Amino acid sequence: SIVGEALEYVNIGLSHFLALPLAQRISLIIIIPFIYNIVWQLLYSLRKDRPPLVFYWIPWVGSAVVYGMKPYEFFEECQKKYGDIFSFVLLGRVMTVYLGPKGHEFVFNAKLADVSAEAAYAHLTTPVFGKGVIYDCPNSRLMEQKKFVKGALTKEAFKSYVPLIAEEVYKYFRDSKNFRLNERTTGTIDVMVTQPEMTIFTASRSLLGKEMRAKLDTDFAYLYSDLDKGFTPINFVFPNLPLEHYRKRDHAQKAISGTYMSLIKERRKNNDIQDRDLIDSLMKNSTYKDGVKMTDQEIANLLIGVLMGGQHTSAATSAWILLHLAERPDVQQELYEEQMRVLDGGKKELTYDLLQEMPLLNQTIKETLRMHHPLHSLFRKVMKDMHVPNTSYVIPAGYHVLVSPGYTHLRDEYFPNAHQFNIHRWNNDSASSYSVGEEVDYGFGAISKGVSSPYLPFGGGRHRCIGEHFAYCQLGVLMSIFIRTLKWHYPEGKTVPPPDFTSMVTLPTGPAKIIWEKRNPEQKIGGRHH
Numbered sequence: 001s002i003v004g005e006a007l008e009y010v011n012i013g014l015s016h017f018l019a020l021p022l023a024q025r026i027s028l029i030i031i032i033p034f035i036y037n038i039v040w041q042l043l044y045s046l047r048k049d050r051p052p053l054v055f056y057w058i059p060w061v062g063s064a065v066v067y068g069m070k071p072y073e074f075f076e077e078c079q080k081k082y083g084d085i086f087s088f089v090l091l092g093r094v095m096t097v098y099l100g101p102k103g104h105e106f107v108f109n110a111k112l113a114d115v116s117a118e119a120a121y122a123h124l125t126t127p128v129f130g131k132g133v134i135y136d137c138p139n140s141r142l143m144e145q146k147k148f149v150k151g152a153l154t155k156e157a158f159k160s161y162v163p164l165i166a167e168e169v170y171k172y173f174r175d176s177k178n179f180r181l182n183e184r185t186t187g188t189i190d191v192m193v194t195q196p197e198m199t200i201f202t203a204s205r206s207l208l209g210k211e212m213r214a215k216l217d218t219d220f221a222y223l224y225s226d227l228d229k230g231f232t233p234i235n236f237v238f239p240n241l242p243l244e245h246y247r248k249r250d251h252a253q254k255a256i257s258g259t260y261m262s263l264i265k266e267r268r269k270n271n272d273i274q275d276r277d278l279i280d281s282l283m284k285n286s287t288y289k290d291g292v293k294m295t296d297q298e299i300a301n302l303l304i305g306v307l308m309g310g311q312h313t314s315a316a317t318s319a320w321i322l323l324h325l326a327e328r329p330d331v332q333q334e335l336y337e338e339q340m341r342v343l344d345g346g347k348k349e350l351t352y353d354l355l356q357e358m359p360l361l362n363q364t365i366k367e368t369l370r371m372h373h374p375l376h377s378l379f380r381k382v383m384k385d386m387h388v389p390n391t392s393y394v395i396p397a398g399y400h401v402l403v404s405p406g407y408t409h410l411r412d413e414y415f416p417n418a419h420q421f422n423i424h425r426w427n428n429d430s431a432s433s434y435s436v437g438e439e440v441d442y443g444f445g446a447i448s449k450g451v452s453s454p455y456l457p458f459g460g461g462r463h464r465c466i467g468e469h470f471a472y473c474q475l476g477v478l479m480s481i482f483i484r485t486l487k488w489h490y491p492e493g494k495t496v497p498p499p500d501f502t503s504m505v506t507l508p509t510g511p512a513k514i515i516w517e518k519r520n521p522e523q524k525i526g527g528r529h530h
């Protein structure tokens with residue numbers, strides 16, 4: 001009755017194992033995890049308390065390639081195979097996707113104790129924005145930072161920003177090599193070149209003020225670019241490894257935050273605190289409820305985070321608006337008639353209040369945000385085992401949850417002919433977003449308690465965007481001026497480009513070129529330039 005001999009042979013086998021030729025050893029160093037991963041999945045598939053897990057061949061990598069390149073196609077296939085809740089492996093992580101409005105509710109309205117945005121995002125955002133702010137702090141601190149920033153984002157602020165943003169757009173038409181409207185009546189433009197510039201110029205001028213806008217006319221502008229390079233998904237996978245673009249990122253965060261602090265300290269020194277810009281607002285309103293004041297460094301870092309939050313979302317959105325309208329001269333025409341009607345043939349200066357009487361313009365923004373949600377996936381890290389109603393699924397701590405309102409934006413069930421750009425689907429519904437009932441306040445103002453709307457370009461729950469009205473103001477002014485000034489169309493044989501999903505936002509695949517032409521070739525934009 002001897003197993004003893006077999007145990008001897010276990011030991012022997014280990015010894016012969018260690019003595020394998022490097023050919024066999026490398027071979028087995030690959031072959032063991034490969035096999036184990038596979039039997040682990042087959043085993044995993046037997047659990048009834050886990051959502052189905054998308055099958056994958058390469059350990060750790062998982063479905064990263066297909067998810068990374070075509071997330072909506074990936075989701076549609078998974079949704080056909082498994083239904084609305086399913087998991088997939090992504091560079092060492094397990095992501096549980098919950099598609100549709102029930103998913104919106106499951107993730108956006110998740111208990112503070114159940115999930116963490118900062119645990120999913122901080123390793124990426126902290127090196128770019130700086131310490132102490134956004135995701136480098138407890139959620140309660142984030143809630144109050146959002147309150148502080150919202151305090152510079154009032155209707156009175158927007159009334160004052162509208163002419164500043166209009167001035168910037170006109171200067172860009174006058175001065176940018178991309179246009180030069182006083183010298184050229186037609187031209188070709190890459191919207192992924194122009195829109196990020198127009199976006200940072202307009203947002204700098206209004207939120208940060210004249211000094212910081214002036215800085216963007218210099219080599220200082222390059223820092224923003226560098227800062228931008230730290231804000232990509234390789235950093236999402238490697239938050240730090242020793243590469244130059246990381247160092248340029250850190251340097252840029254320091255130099256830019258340094259410039260912000262210099263202005264702030266100069267203002268406090270000269271008692272030159274007004275109500276002009278978000279800087280003046282944070283200088284007056286940045287004490288948390290426990291009485292601790294944000295430091296000047298944290299104020300600057302928060303300024304960087306806020307501007308970054310508006311930068312890629314807004315730039316991508318105006319790129320897509322231009323791109324969709326480039327093949328819809330009927331829509332340009334309709335928007336132009338609205339401009340002439342609301343602004344008395346141009347004899348009225350554009351104001352914030354008049355932007356609110358441009359429903360077609362606002363529906364154009366809304367519809368572009370439907371077809372092109374800038375963020376295809378939003379994440380949380382699961383901190384406590386979560387039960388999914390009405391199921392037997394448990395999402396264990398250590399998993400991530402992924403919600404995709406932009407995928408639902410593109411489903412025929414919620415938006416008939418979802419792949420058709422139709423601003424009129426929003427007729428009698430021009431609002432950037434509508435809370436369809438009860439509200440709740442997480443610390444930065446009353447917002448919709450339910451997050452079941454199939455349309456959620458600005459998310460929902462405690463992490464909801466606070467920049468929505470700024471974005472509509474900025475996009476509104478910008479597009480109002482584009483429409484009143486220019487007609488545009490595609491080069492022959494060109495059409496709307498497919499999205500690039502690999503980037504930080506779902507921007508168009510470039511070069512995405514449009515040809516513009518002046519509606520009034522003889523019109524001059526005044527003011528001095530060199």
Ligand code: HEM
Pocket residue numbers: 117142146306307309310311313314317369373374375378379456457458459460462463464465466467468470471
């Ligand atoms: C078209 C324009 C925009 C879109 C579609 C958009 C979208 C979003 C979304 C979906 C979220 C939720 C993120 C999550 O739940 O994980 C969010 C959060 C946020 N965004 Fe926006 N955004 C836009 C513009 C802006 C602008 C213009 C600003 C600043 C002026 C801004 C600043 C913020 C801030 C501070 C948050 C809060 C993040 C948090 O609480 O974790 N965004 N945005």
Ligand SMILES: CC(C)=CCC[C@@H](C)[C@H]1CC[C@@]2(C)C3=C(CC[C@]12C)[C@@]1(C)CC[C@H](O)C(C)(C)[C@@H]1CC3
Pocket residue numbers: 068121125134233305306308309310375376377378379501502503504505
């Ligand atoms: C491989 C790919 C494209 C994965 C998609 C993940 C990113 C593209 C998205 C998901 C989370 C995301 C929406 C986020 C942001 C940008 C785009 C992200 C990283 C940022 C960091 C933008 C800056 C903003 O201030 C804020 C901090 C609110 C968000 C946070 C989440």
